[PDB]
Amino acid sequence: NPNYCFAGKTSSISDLKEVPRKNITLIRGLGHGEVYEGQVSSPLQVAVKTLPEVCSEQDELDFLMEALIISKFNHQNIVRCIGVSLQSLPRFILLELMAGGDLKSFLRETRPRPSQPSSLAMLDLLHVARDIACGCQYLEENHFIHRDIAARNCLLTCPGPGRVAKIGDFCAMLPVKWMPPEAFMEGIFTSKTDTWSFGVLLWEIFSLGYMPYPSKSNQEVLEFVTSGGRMDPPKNCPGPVYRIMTQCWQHQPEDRPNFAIILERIEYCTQDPDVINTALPI
Numbered sequence: 001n002p003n004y005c006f007a008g009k010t011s012s013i014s015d016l017k018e019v020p021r022k023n024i025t026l027i028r029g030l031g032h033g034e035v036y037e038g039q040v041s042s043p044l045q046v047a048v049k050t051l052p053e054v055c056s057e058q059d060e061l062d063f064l065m066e067a068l069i070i071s072k073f074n075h076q077n078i079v080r081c082i083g084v085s086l087q088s089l090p091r092f093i094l095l096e097l098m099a100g101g102d103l104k105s106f107l108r109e110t111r112p113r114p115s116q117p118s119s120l121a122m123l124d125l126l127h128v129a130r131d132i133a134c135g136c137q138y139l140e141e142n143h144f145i146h147r148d149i150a151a152r153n154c155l156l157t158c159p160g161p162g163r164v165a166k167i168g169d170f171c172a173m174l175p176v177k178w179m180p181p182e183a184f185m186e187g188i189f190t191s192k193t194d195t196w197s198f199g200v201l202l203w204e205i206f207s208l209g210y211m212p213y214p215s216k217s218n219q220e221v222l223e224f225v226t227s228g229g230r231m232d233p234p235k236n237c238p239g240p241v242y243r244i245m246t247q248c249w250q251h252q253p254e255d256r257p258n259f260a261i262i263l264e265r266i267e268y269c270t271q272d273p274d275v276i277n278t279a280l281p282i
């Protein structure tokens, strides 16, 4: 019944590809509604996001809206929507399977150790950062504000070389630690509010999945950031990369880069041997 607009065109539930329910098979649980690995009847491998049957009426419309929103993107750095199963219960959104999993656990689980000497290098992190910036620029070019850019909301196509990172998810619960001053004080959101969050995600990537402001509470962060406090560089983080983070966290939004420039700056970093030859901490 409710419709939705993006890049000039309005659409509704009717435009979603409704796949029969008996053609969908679940398998293993992947994470928390919850997400399952699935199969659609060379059969097609999918992820299935479920809406719990025990839920309010508000929850279902939020769910419906998400299928519409994700179905409407066409970009290689945003997880594809395969289809939906809304007419049988529980309701399903079918999504591109991302064998690399969540970006945060990936960083946490593949951190170099004497076990995995160089299981990952500086250049691999920059490529992950560029990928998400590319998806964010597409969002920005289409006047869509994500509001929750974070490693926990990014996914990887595979574990090994050639992995591609894509955006995969859309009071006290607000992710304060990823929000610029104008977001949490005034509720003002812009493409520049996504820019701030991307800087934090950038800290997330180069810290290899450490929680931001590791010893601060949400309120301490709110007071810290307002007073002009910013995070220190991740361990061993190259200066050119840290410089992108600090520019993303400029206090006035008009002084933060748009995503075209951020993309431009990340690519420049990948052309700098002193950046890409820096060893990750073990």
Ligand SMILES: Cc1cc(-c2cnc3ccc(N[C@@H](C)c4ccc(F)cc4F)nn23)n[nH]1
Pocket (backbone or CB within 6 Å): 030, 031, 032, 035, 047, 079, 095, 096, 097, 098, 099, 100, 101, 102, 103, 152, 153, 154, 155, 167, 168, 169
């Ligand atoms: C949509 C999709 C998810 C996977 C996948 C593949 N391996 C995993 C492992 C955990 C996971 N956790 C869930 C809760 C999740 C994490 C991050 C995110 F951005 C979205 C998301 F649903 N998801 N996951 N492939 N495709």
